[PDB]
Design a binder for these strands. Structure first.
Ligand SMILES: Nc1ncnc2c1ncn2[C@@H]1O[C@H](COP(=O)(O)OP(=O)(O)NP(=O)(O)O)[C@@H](O)[C@H]1O
Ligand SMILES: Nc1ncnc2c1ncn2[C@@H]1O[C@H](COP(=O)(O)OP(=O)(O)NP(=O)(O)O)[C@@H](O)[C@H]1O
Ligand SMILES: [Mg+2]
Ligand SMILES: [Mg+2]
Ligand SMILES: [Mg+2]
Ligand SMILES: [Mg+2]
Ligand SMILES: [Mg+2]
Ligand SMILES: [Mg+2]
Ligand SMILES: [Mg+2]
Ligand SMILES: [Mg+2]
Ligand SMILES: [Mg+2]
Ligand SMILES: [Mg+2]
Ligand SMILES: [Mg+2]
Ligand SMILES: [Mg+2]
Ligand SMILES: [Mg+2]
Ligand SMILES: [Mg+2]
Ligand SMILES: [Mg+2]
Ligand SMILES: [Mg+2]
Ligand SMILES: [Mg+2]
Ligand SMILES: [Mg+2]
Ligand SMILES: [Mg+2]
Ligand SMILES: [Mg+2]
Ligand SMILES: [Mg+2]
Ligand SMILES: [Mg+2]
Ligand SMILES: [Mg+2]
Ligand SMILES: [Mg+2]
Ligand SMILES: [Mg+2]
Ligand SMILES: [Mg+2]
Ligand SMILES: [Mg+2]
Ligand SMILES: [Mg+2]
Ligand SMILES: [Mg+2]
Ligand SMILES: [Mg+2]
Ligand SMILES: [Mg+2]
Ligand SMILES: [Mg+2]
Ligand SMILES: [Mg+2]
Ligand SMILES: [Mg+2]
Ligand SMILES: [Mg+2]
Ligand SMILES: [Mg+2]
Ligand SMILES: [Mg+2]
Ligand SMILES: [Mg+2]
Ligand SMILES: [Mg+2]
Ligand SMILES: [Mg+2]
Ligand SMILES: [Mg+2]
Ligand SMILES: [Mg+2]
Ligand SMILES: [Mg+2]
Ligand SMILES: [Mg+2]
Ligand SMILES: [Mg+2]
Ligand SMILES: [Mg+2]
Ligand SMILES: [Mg+2]
Ligand SMILES: [Mg+2]
Ligand SMILES: [Mg+2]
Ligand SMILES: [Mg+2]
Ligand SMILES: [Mg+2]
Ligand SMILES: [Mg+2]
Ligand SMILES: [Mg+2]
Ligand SMILES: [Mg+2]
Ligand SMILES: [Mg+2]
Ligand SMILES: [Mg+2]
Ligand SMILES: [Mg+2]
Ligand SMILES: [Mg+2]
Ligand SMILES: [Mg+2]
Ligand SMILES: [Mg+2]
Ligand SMILES: [Mg+2]
Ligand SMILES: [Mg+2]
Ligand SMILES: [Mg+2]
Ligand SMILES: [Mg+2]
Ligand SMILES: [Zn+2]
Lengths: 547, 76, 49
RNA sequence: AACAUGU
RNA sequence: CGCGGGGUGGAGCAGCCUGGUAGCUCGUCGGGCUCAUAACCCGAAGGUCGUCGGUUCAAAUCCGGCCCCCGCAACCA
RNA sequence: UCUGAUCGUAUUGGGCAUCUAACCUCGAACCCUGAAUCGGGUUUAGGGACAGUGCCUGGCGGGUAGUUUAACUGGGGCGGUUGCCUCCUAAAAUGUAACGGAGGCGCCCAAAGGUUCCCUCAACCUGGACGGCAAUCAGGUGGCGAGUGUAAAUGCACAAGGGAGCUUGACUGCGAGACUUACAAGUCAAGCAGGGACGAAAGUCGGGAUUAGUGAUCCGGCACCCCCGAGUGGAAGGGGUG
RNA sequence: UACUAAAAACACAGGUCCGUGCGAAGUCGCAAGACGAUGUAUACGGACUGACGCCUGCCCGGUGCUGGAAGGUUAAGAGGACCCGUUAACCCGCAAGGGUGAAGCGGAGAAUUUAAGCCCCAGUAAACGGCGGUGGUAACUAUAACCAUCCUAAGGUAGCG
RNA sequence: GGGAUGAGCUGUGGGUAGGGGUGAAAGGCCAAUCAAACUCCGUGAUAGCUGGUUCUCCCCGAAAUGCAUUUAGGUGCAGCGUUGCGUGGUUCACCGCGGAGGUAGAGCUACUGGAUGGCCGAUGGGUUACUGACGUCAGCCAAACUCCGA
RNA sequence: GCCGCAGCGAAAGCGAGUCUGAAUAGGGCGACCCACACGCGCAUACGCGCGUGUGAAUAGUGGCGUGUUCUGGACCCGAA
RNA sequence: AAUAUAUAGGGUGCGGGAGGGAACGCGGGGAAGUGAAACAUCUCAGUACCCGUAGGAGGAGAAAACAAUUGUGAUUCCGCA
């Protein structure tokens, strides 16, 4: 069994925060590895070593011969051409210009000399039979109907958040590399597309590495589980219910070993201050053991966790949002048609729908950044909102994380109260000298965490959150949903995490469109578990993508 | 036995005027080694990095006042 | 916090200069315009990895 | 399963 | 004298080398329960962080300067 | 013939069980043996591919062996200190000791470096929405009492201090001649050439207003140059410059 | 303690704990052998108290000793993908060079497989060891039987001073 | 003065050997020697430490400081002695001229601090019999104060 | 055989030069006779280049002495 | 012999060995003081000492050797390098 990727004595560290230290492991074809770990462990930095983007400090992390590699970054890039032209840049990347050379020589060789160009239309034709590119048009027309892509002739600027991930999954799954590097593939996707990607990654010739924070995508695609602790990597097999056992066990034995090391210090620190008696001397061997036990008691300080704390706004009145017969559409396609609801006070409203159906356009009519076609939105004089788009200003990639929350100022207003800015970003995890990290080097778990710092400093009593459960681990995801239950205003949450809307929701707004209407919604007074029961009282073959 | 924490000091840096006035020098000799510009460069004298007042031309050193600031010059 | 970095030419890939940056202030690679003795003219130098 | 006291 | 801990609400202690938001138990104060007092339940008030002089945007914390309290060494003739 | 499951022969290792023939027996009897609680042999009764021993290998190891365990010091110990920068001691050049008197340093800055151009501060006084001793504004007076990334001295208002434009000289090949110095080191340097930055030019720039922010030699690592290449062509390893 | 120390030191009879199932454990030996003992757990050896009388409290966190074997970590041996050196041949060519390179022999060798130990989970103090602070409170005063709080593996009981 | 039928005292012959013996345990004893016996050999061990080192005259003539040191009672290089060969007044004294200085002294409304007594009086304390800032008129002080200055 | 006979360079090598360097730039190390007429683009006089000298001033090596040094017990005596 | 073939052991007759010597030789075992201004690698040194075994000498000795592509042609020992 010849491998695909190997690492030998690899050590990568960003100064004090080590990512690897003397790791050595091999990736053989047919592996289905799901890599886990908390935020700051280094999961996206390992996959950029394996993609050839980054390089380790020392050690030899190389690749097998042949064996091309495709990576999905955690924020995937796109071009500025069409959707049909967005898929040909990967998977059909090098093979379209062989097709764009063979049709060139179909008229250039006729009007020119036919002896050197005879073989130039020959060795192209030898690269169209083993790769089978004679029907390259309909190979694109299949790989768009598998991921259910948006149509061919539209720009990639006015797309969804999940439609920009459906078009980026189609780039890598056409290349068919011998080593996938999926960095959070199930972000922004609905339940239909994640169920698709489970059955596609089952039958797949090649190694699959996939860093995920959820627990149900991993148990269907991964049988081996790799972990990233503070530097070390701990490979074993399981199904992520045994990951949370073994992670909580390493900290159990470490807690009552650092505690036993602590009582050895206080019995020894009492010796070094005891003062030397008559002419016998205090032993320099025991002074040297104390000065080396004090150093190993300082490279173990790991407890630093602050709860997410949402600021309370002013007192909220009886009318929060009123919507009377709302219509919204960008073309002849209609998204919202005859919608009437009224947002409650002191609840959580979950918004349900598949990709490209108008959940984010629904928020932009409430904040006023869009305009209703017919019908009105009414807010009410006590309501102060809190909302920031993902696209209109967002973050700036070379301002530091302290001057994005602040604007270079010392103290900030989080709503009729004065708090320091460095005491505010440190309440959101960014502590110590990590407050000078610019926005480009922030990871996905601390770009979602930065985005909560910008929205919640507006001090509102109606917070609108568009997918807060995006790149957060289970320690702080439970800390966020704790703070949405101690919140005395109305919170509206768009999500696709089915086991996050089942936990903290009191009202459900869901798309129940079918073939004749395609644009109707539904308001439900109750939680998500009771909406599934009420759904069945009112009221598939896997698409292949290749051949 | 109240051991004072007041013992240390730095090595002397051999500062001062190293060639005096009316004295024949070669091109490039050091005239005044000093901290800051206690003496200023006059004619045919350059300052240097640590204010060392070298010579640009062989000749005779002469000192003088030029609008308050005391200067060092070389008469070729 | 101030590591020592080596700057390499972007044409012939010789490592001509060593210097120090700040890793928190400049997380990305340093591009300067230094003089390569191999090429004989000032050319774009960039850090190594 | 609760339950001490009385110028 | 010399070392090296310590001073935080009325009493006891966290927080401190990991600078930003002063906390925990009892006690005090007002209301309940009881025939009444306890116990228990509810709501509150209370601190120049020993004093004063330095860095920082910001000090109970970091660093000096003094004032008390506690512990330990003072061995060989 | 591919991916996966399954069956079958041949082969080859790992456990477990049984066997006896290597090996083991201070169980027994007989013989050399005339005198033998030694030893060897024969047969028997048991153990058995284990144990024991060889070579390789991890652990454990004051049981034993060889040794180390600094100096200054108002005797030694205890306490303190050890290199580097700044001032007083220092007796008007330099230098100068003490467990003499005060502080710092083991960095920081991709501009807080280079260049061209422009500007002057603190404090005080009068007027002014929130505005207070003091935010920002306007006008008087003000020659250095502010400021200098960082201790202190020497300096700096002509600014080396406050602001803006473009940039990488925080260079490569050298360096006559000097300061300091036991040696080893440490420090300054006009100017010539390549190739650049800024400036209309003259010109200035081999990092920072200056002096602290560091470590000899050996042995190794890396990139580059293709210098030697143990019969010859290669390579191993050495060599040069960074 | 011949030769400045005859005692309160050592021994002792009694006590307990641990080791030993039999050419035993322990000891002298490189080994054969020997002692133990021509003895066989009421015997033999090692440790610590020291007739007798009344007694011998609490602590298993530390460090040992005994047992366990889930998990981590871990040697040689087995295994020998890939990579590098050399070159039959081939390709561009100036055959002054450059590139690709089978088989073979060598260099350096990864995944995988693998015991004790150590970390780990338990018991053990007649195992080496350890057995707390500050403040209030009663008929004049005084002292606290009593209470508050912090901490530990547990806070020095009987008796004595 | 203690034991003196007992764990007694003694004779003759025998066994245990040096990191070993033996020890009712004192580091005791092992040939007048024991925190590792004695004797030959390695061997003329080594000692930054102490002692000693022998005949004469003639010329010149020091040092006890600097830097470094597992260094401080030792040593290396310098400094100072002598001698061979080079150089020849370049050394030093005095007089004349050209130069930098911040001690002694003095000064401080020239700065940073200290500081006596008057006058004015911001604040603070009980309409103000106490506090007395900042200014101001005379008299002062300083190694880390200097407009000056031998 | 040794020392002298030519050096420079890490070394291939080149050689009264050679190494660094892009350098007919500068340096490092090494060679290199005016006190003397003439000839000598020459220069008021003085030298440069170059024949003849006015027939310039060099030099090493081996023996035996002496001073110090190296390896030996190394000036002699002395431990535990 | 036990035990059958037989061997261990036993009988008789012939030959030989043992131990000493001042040095030198060969093969095997193998220190420490000392030098490194301490010391462990290293040195002292395969020395001192010990064990086996000789000979008048001993060991080595007739190329599975060197060389550099021309050549020398068993070993020992002295001089150089
Ligand atoms: N500016 C626009 N012009 C035209 N069409 C648009 C625009 N913005 C969004 N759309 C389309 O409107 C539909 C829904 O938009 P959007 O609200 O962003 O869906 P969505 O809920 O965000 N999908 P998702 O959040 O990934 O689950 C998609 O088909 C978009 O392509
Ligand atoms: N270039 C950089 N310089 C300095 N620090 C960096 C740099 N890149 C990354 N980091 C830091 O190292 C961490 C490594 O990021 P990483 O953990 O790989 O992302 P992540 O694991 O995917 N986070 P998440 O996706 O939520 O799990 C970042 O969170 C930063 O704190
Ligand atoms: Mg990520
Ligand atoms: Mg969306
Ligand atoms: Mg000084
Ligand atoms: Mg400088
Ligand atoms: Mg920047
Ligand atoms: Mg009450
Ligand atoms: Mg005494
Ligand atoms: Mg074995
Ligand atoms: Mg020892
Ligand atoms: Mg020794
Ligand atoms: Mg001493
Ligand atoms: Mg003393
Ligand atoms: Mg002086
Ligand atoms: Mg003087
Ligand atoms: Mg200090
Ligand atoms: Mg600038
Ligand atoms: Mg400026
Ligand atoms: Mg630099
Ligand atoms: Mg020079
Ligand atoms: Mg130039
Ligand atoms: Mg120009
Ligand atoms: Mg210059
Ligand atoms: Mg500076
Ligand atoms: Mg060395
Ligand atoms: Mg060769
Ligand atoms: Mg090489
Ligand atoms: Mg060079
Ligand atoms: Mg006696
Ligand atoms: Mg006696
Ligand atoms: Mg006696
Ligand atoms: Mg007994
Ligand atoms: Mg027993
Ligand atoms: Mg035994
Ligand atoms: Mg015991
Ligand atoms: Mg006793
Ligand atoms: Mg236990
Ligand atoms: Mg055990
Ligand atoms: Mg017990
Ligand atoms: Mg008692
Ligand atoms: Mg008697
Ligand atoms: Mg008597
Ligand atoms: Mg008697
Ligand atoms: Mg005898
Ligand atoms: Mg004793
Ligand atoms: Mg004796
Ligand atoms: Mg001894
Ligand atoms: Mg000797
Ligand atoms: Mg001697
Ligand atoms: Mg004389
Ligand atoms: Mg000397
Ligand atoms: Mg004069
Ligand atoms: Mg004078
Ligand atoms: Mg002075
Ligand atoms: Mg004076
Ligand atoms: Mg004054
Ligand atoms: Mg006064
Ligand atoms: Mg003075
Ligand atoms: Mg040479
Ligand atoms: Mg030259
Ligand atoms: Mg013989
Ligand atoms: Mg030795
Ligand atoms: Mg020695
Ligand atoms: Mg010595
Ligand atoms: Mg022979
Ligand atoms: Zn280049």
């Amino acid at each position: 069994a010849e491998f695909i990727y190997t690492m030998k004595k690899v050590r990568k560290a960003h100064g004090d925060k080590v990512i690897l230290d003397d790791v050595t492991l091999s990736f053989y074809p047919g592996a289905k590895i799901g890599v886990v770990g908390p935020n700051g462990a280094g999961k996206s930095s390992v996959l950029r070593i394996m993609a050839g983007l980054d390089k380790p400090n020392n050690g030899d992390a190389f690749l097998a011969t042949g064996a091309t590699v495709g990576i999905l970054q955690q924020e995937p890039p796109l071009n500025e051409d069409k959707t049909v032209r967005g898929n040909v840049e990967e998977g059909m990347g090098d093979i379209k210009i062989k097709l764009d050379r063979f049709n060139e020589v179909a008229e250039l060789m006729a009007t020119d000399y036919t002896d050197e160009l005879m073989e130039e239309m020959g060795r192209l034709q030898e690269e169209l039979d083993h790769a089978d590119a004679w029907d390259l048009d309909a190979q694109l027309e299949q790989a768009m109907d598998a991921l259910r892509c948006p149509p061919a002739d539209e720009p990639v600027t006015n797309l969804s958040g999940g439609e920009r991930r459906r078009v980026a999954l189609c780039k890598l799954l056409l290349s068919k590399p011998d080593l996938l590097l999926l960095d959070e593939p199930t972000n922004h996707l609905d339940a239909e597309s994640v169920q698709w990607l489970e059955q596609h990654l089952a039958s797949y010739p090649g190694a699959i590495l996939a860093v995920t924070h959820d627990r149900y995508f991993l148990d269907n695609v991964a049988e081996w589980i790799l972990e990233l602790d503070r530097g070390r990597a701990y490979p074993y097999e399981g199904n992520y219910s045994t990951y949370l056992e073994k992670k909580a066990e390493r900290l159990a034995v470490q807690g009552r070993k650092d505690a036993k090391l602590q009582k050895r210090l206080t019995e020894e620190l009492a010796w070094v201050r005891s003062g030397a008696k008559a002419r016998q001397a205090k032993s320099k061997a025991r002074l040297q053991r104390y000065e080396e036990m004090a150093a190993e008691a300082e490279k173990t300080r790991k407890l630093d966790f602050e709860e997410i704390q949402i600021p309370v706004g002013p007192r909220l009145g009886n009318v929060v949002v009123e919507v009377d017969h709302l219509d919204k559409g960008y073309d002849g396609r209609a998204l919202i048609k005859d919608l009437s609801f009224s947002l409650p006070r002191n609840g959580i409203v979950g918004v349900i729908g598949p990709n490209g159906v108008g959940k984010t356009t629904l928020f932009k009519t409430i904040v006023g950044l869009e305009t209703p076609d017919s019908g009105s939105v009414k807010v009410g004089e006590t309501v102060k909102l809190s909302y920031v788009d993902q696209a209109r200003a967002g973050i700036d990639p070379r301002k530091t994380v302290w001057e994005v929350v602040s604007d270079g100022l010392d103290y900030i207003q989080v709503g009729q109260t004065e708090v320091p800015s460095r005491a505010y970003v440190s309440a959101f995890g960014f502590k110590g000298p990590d407050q000078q990290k610019p926005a480009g080097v922030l990871s996905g778990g601390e770009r979602n965490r930065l985005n909560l710092a910008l929205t919640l400093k507006q001090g509102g009593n109606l917070i609108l959150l568009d997918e807060p459960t995006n790149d957060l681990d289970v320690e702080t995801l439970g800390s966020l949903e704790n703070a949405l239950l101690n919140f005395p205003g109305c919170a509206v949450v768009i999500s696709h995490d089915r086991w996050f809307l089942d936990r903290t929701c009191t009202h459900i707004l869901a798309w129940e469109g079918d073939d004749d209407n395609e644009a109707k919604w539904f308001w439900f007074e109750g939680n998500f578990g009771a909406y599934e029961e009420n759904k069945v009282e009112r009221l598939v073959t896997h698409r292949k993508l290749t051949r | 036995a109240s051991s004072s924490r007041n013992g240390r000091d730095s090595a002397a840096q051999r500062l001062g005027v190293k060639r005096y006035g009316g004295q024949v020098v070669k091109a490039g000799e050091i005239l005044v080694r000093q901290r800051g510009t206690k003496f200023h460069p006059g004619v045919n004298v350059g300052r240097g990095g640590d204010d060392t007042l070298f010579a640009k031309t062989a000749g005779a050193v002469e000192f003088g006042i030029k609008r308050g600031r005391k200067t060092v010059s070389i008469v070729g | 916090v101030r590591p020592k970095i080596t700057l390499a030419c972007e044409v012939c890939k010789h490592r001509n200069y060593i210097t120090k940056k700040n890793r928190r202030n400049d997380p990305d690679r340093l591009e300067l315009k230094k003089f390569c003795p191999n090429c004989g003219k000032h050319q774009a130098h960039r850090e190594t990895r």
